[PDB]
Amino acid sequence: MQHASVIAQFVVEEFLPDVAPADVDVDLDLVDNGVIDSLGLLKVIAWLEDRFGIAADDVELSPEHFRSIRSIDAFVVGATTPPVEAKLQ
């Protein structure tokens, strides 16, 4: 989307950064990577407030949000909206 490539690249960088994140089928449900739901979610929540200065907003949890990468892209777009770039080079 406007910056969905950064989300996949940013999220994947924590797990497999030595591999091109754009070379990963972003059409795969990241549920398998649910690992970020807890370990990464805590690091991302604290990091998000550390860099962007946004409240963790962990009052409500939505496990269904990790069902697909696109679902997460909408959450970031609604909260923040970075520059728009072409996902495919």
Whose tokens are 């497999």? That residue is: 16
- Based on the shown chain and the rule CB under 6 A, indicate whether residue 75 belongs to the binding site for ligand 7V9: yes
**Distance in Å, CB of 15 to ligand 7V9, minimum:** 14
Q: Which is nearer to ligand 7V9, 23 or 63 (CB)?
A: 63
- The enclosing H or E element of 43 equals helix 41-51
> Binders of ligand 7V9: how many residues, by CB under 6 A?
14
Burial (CB < 10 A; 0-12, 13-18, 19+), residue 18, is exposed
SS3 for 76?
helix
Q: Which is nearer to ligand 7V9, 28 or 59 (CB)?
A: 59
Q: What would the x/- binding string for ligand 7V9 be over residues 9 to 48, using CB under 6 A?
A: -------------------------x--xx--x--x---x
Q: Give me 3's structure tokens.
A: 């910056």
